[PDB]
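Subject: for your reference before the review

Hello V.,

The reviewers asked for a structural picture of the protein, and I figured it would be easier to keep everything in one thread rather than splitting it across files. Below is the amino acid sequence we used in the manuscript, unchanged from the supplementary table.
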Amino acid sequence: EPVVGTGASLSVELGPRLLTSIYDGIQRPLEVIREKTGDFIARGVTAPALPRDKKWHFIPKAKVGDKVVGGDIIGEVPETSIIVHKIMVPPGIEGEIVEIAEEGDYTIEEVIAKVKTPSGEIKELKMYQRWPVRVKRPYKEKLPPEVPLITGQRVIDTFFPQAKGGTAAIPGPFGSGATVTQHQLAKWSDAQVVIYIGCGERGNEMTDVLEEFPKLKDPKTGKPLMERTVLIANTSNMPVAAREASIYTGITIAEYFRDMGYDVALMADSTSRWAEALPAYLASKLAEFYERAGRVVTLGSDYRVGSVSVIGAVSPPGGDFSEPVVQNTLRVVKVFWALDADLARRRHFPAINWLTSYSLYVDAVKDWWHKNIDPEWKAMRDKAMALLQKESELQEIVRIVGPDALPERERAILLVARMLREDYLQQDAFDEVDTYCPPEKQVTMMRVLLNFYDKTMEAINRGVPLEEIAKLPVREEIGRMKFERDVSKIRSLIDKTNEQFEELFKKYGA
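And here is what came back from the structure prediction:
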């Protein structure tokens, strides 16, 4: 069907079987064909988004007589072994449930409920709904950033945190082999659902994502990661129009999962100039995309919260990073994790530059850390950063005049900053233990390091040579603590540090 005014009604279907699916930017299944854009309209007569032949187990949640509003949960469909699909009343629909399907098996075109609206109108409800991708799904309230998206990656969670509902950028493309943060984020972030727009896809980078993603295991469950993932593919052969539409299709599907009460992570990939469809107005529209991120009290009769957190890849034409697409993206995002080729070459992993990255969410999430994890989280983070800033200043100077004239105190700062970089920032994504670092382990590791700092400065303030501190036996254990899964063992290193230093205080006197 046609449509008057701007918008040829570009829409997406939302309901069972979104998970495990692979689509183009216009929600047609894997390896499907061509459409074209404009300030107006677009075409398409090809393939269906959700299979109409699949039988789903529907469990009714509401009953005849219940009053309902848009967003209310009227049933449950176990969609994969990981995710229960929540069947919701579409937005704009409210009234009395006059008819609802018994528990059993149904295809998505079967009417599973009917609602009588205030005026008497009878509306038929199915397991899916449709929504225009260019219209933000509505919600009751957008909440201020408050709760961290816990990534389990120390540098991110500690120094450059993402809020649930927040917006982050990282240098792209995702399919890049020089780093693995992009993948760590997808599997470890405490979002239940991942919407992934593999869009830096060109050459073998397409078929890389095709044959490996059904094999990737969700480490939280042992089950396949695809079972909580919707994949959306932008290839170089695809119509530039479907590739422009791709992120709206993505974000709309994400919003749909947040509406159920899930936290969702939208990961957007990019090669150079991912668009050509539709002045500075472009910058203003990318802005509108990012503004659709958020944690919200959702529609429904029950108080209910879900979120979409956005992580966008940023890869500029020349890779100098003063190009428009990077200026525009970095203007609206609240977090930037600066992947740094020089860090990577030195095999400092993850290769996140801790001087040029930033998060504007630190104060927003500090209270959740303080109340749930550690009362000193923010103070500790600021202290370790101050150490890292100092380190950088000292290295600059030492590049000019050399290290021979350094006082013990400055060498001590370099010693402890080095321990910070090696024992805390660096993290081993390939290790069965250090691949994820629980909040509780992060703070305890930090306490160990900062206590080591306090004791180093105190000890040199008492004329203990630094050389004696650099070789304190506990240092080796502090270096290995990221590999320890038992946090109480890590914690014990504080007392162990204290007494070793005591043996040092006695071996020197006064």
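For the response letter, the relevant points are probably these. Residues 54-128 form a domain with the OB fold (Dihydrolipoamide Acetyltransferase, E2P) fold (CATH 2.40.50.100). The chain has three domains: 1-53+129-359, 54-128, 360-510.

Happy to draft the paragraph if you're swamped.

O.
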